[PDB]
């Protein structure tokens, strides 16, 4: 994994463009990923 | 268990599987030329 | 929305299909975000 250097992020699939890091944001425990607005993926959780 | 299943159900009793918590690995499927029909539908087989 | 397509992110798409197939979907996506776009281009032009 790397933090803070855009690169090509493939999530369980799920893939596309740009830079992750720490959120902010803290997910419940059942949820697997969230979307803002319409069809911006903002933040996943590392499967691994 | 289910490609080199001893028998295999009637068309009127097609016969439901489950399958989860496993890596498929289709490579090995459509690289042998023992099927005589491959077709796919939506997805390319190739891209598995 | 999807346009009708198989799904409405290009990553999908062109992951599941291969380009002899995946054409006419990209295709479909095309023609319908061209027509969002020059709708809100003219929308903005009346009202600039």
Same mark, same amino acid.
């Given at each position: 994994?790397?933090?803070?250097?855009?690169?090509?992020?493939?999530?369980?699939?799920?893939?596309?463009?740009?830079?992750?890091?720490?959120?902010?944001?803290?997910?419940?425990?059942?949820?697997?990923?969230?979307?803002?607005?319409?069809?911006?993926?903002?933040?996943?959780?590392?499967?691994? | 268990? !289910?490609?080199?299943?001893?028998?295999?159900?009637? !068309?009127?009793?097609?016969?439901? /599987?489950?399958?989860?918590?496993? !890596?498929?690995?289709?490579?090995?499927?459509?690289?042998?030329?023992?099927?005589?029909?491959? /077709?796919?539908?939506? !997805?390319?087989?190739? /891209?598995? | 929305?999807?346009?009708?397509?198989?799904?409405?992110? #290009?990553?999908? %798409?062109?992951?599941? #299909?291969?380009?002899? +197939?995946? +054409?006419?979907? %990209?295709?479909?996506? %095309?023609?319908?975000?061209?027509?969002?776009?020059?709708?809100?281009?003219?929308?903005? #032009?009346?009202?600039?």
């Amino acid at each position: 994994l790397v933090k803070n250097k855009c690169v090509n992020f493939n999530f369980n699939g799920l893939t596309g463009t740009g830079v992750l890091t720490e959120s902010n944001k803290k997910f419940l425990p059942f949820q697997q990923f969230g979307r803002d607005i319409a069809d911006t993926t903002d933040a996943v959780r590392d499967p691994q | 268990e !289910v490609f080199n299943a001893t028998r295999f159900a009637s !068309v009127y009793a097609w016969n439901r /599987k489950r399958i989860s918590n496993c !890596v498929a690995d289709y490579s090995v499927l459509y690289n042998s030329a023992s099927f005589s029909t491959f /077709k796919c539908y939506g !997805v390319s087989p190739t /891209k598995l | 929305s999807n346009f009708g397509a198989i799904s409405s992110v #290009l990553n999908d %798409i062109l992951s599941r #299909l291969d380009p002899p +197939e995946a +054409e006419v979907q %990209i295709d479909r996506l %095309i023609t319908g975000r061209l027509q969002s776009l020059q709708t809100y281009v003219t929308q903005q #032009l009346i009202r600039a």
